[PDB]
Design a protein around this ligand. Structure first.
Ligand code: CA
Length: 182
């Protein structure tokens, strides 16, 4: 690691520098490069969520962090990705839920895009639990809709980042929706 990346990581986690270091060493033993590939990263999720199709979701999470598209996530970005994938910190989290959702990366979210992640996210719910799901929103096609709803202005065209951070922050109903299993 590097001193700066050790703190950007410790001031984004309840992880100690000492821990982030032991971690690195372990990570480096599997990726001597100090960087991890989408292929590899995807496996991480297929392993710990055997009861679903994490493949899709994982790929999206991956794209959301691999900034300057090298097809690889390095330790730092990789770490903060394993985070905004579990639960907890949610603002430091929703300031990323936009990145995950603005799939094509421009600067605005579409109805398809919302539906693409809602579905990918859905494919992660063990079929078992797929049922304990509040019917109004218990299928991809639905939830996507019970979301593009709150953001009103059903443009069936666009949703800027302003309206996203506001709707998410304002009403915590969409926040619960748009986001994964915390
Ligand atoms: Ca977009």
């Amino acid at each position: 690691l590097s001193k700066e990346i050790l703190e950007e990581l410790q001031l984004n986690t309840k992880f100690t520098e000492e821990e982030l270091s032991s971690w690195y060493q372990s990570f480096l033993k599997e990726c001597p490069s100090g960087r991890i590939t989408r292929q590899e990263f995807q496996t991480i999720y297929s392993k710990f969520f055997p009861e679903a199709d994490p493949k899709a979701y994982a790929q999206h999470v991956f794209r959301s962090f691999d900034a300057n598209s090298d097809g690889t996530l390095d330790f730092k970005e990789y770490v903060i990705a394993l985070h905004m994938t579990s639960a907890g910190k949610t603002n430091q989290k929703l300031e990323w839920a936009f990145s995950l959702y603005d799939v094509d990366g421009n600067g605005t979210i579409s109805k398809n895009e919302v539906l693409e992640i809602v579905t990918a996210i859905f494919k992660m719910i063990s079929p078992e639990d797929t049922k304990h799901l509040p019917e109004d929103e218990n299928t991809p096609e639905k939830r996507a809709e019970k979301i593009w709803g709150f953001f009103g202005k059903k443009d069936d065209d666009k949703l800027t980042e302003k309206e996203f951070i506001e709707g998410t922050l304002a009403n915590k109903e969409i926040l619960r929706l748009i986001q994964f299993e915390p």
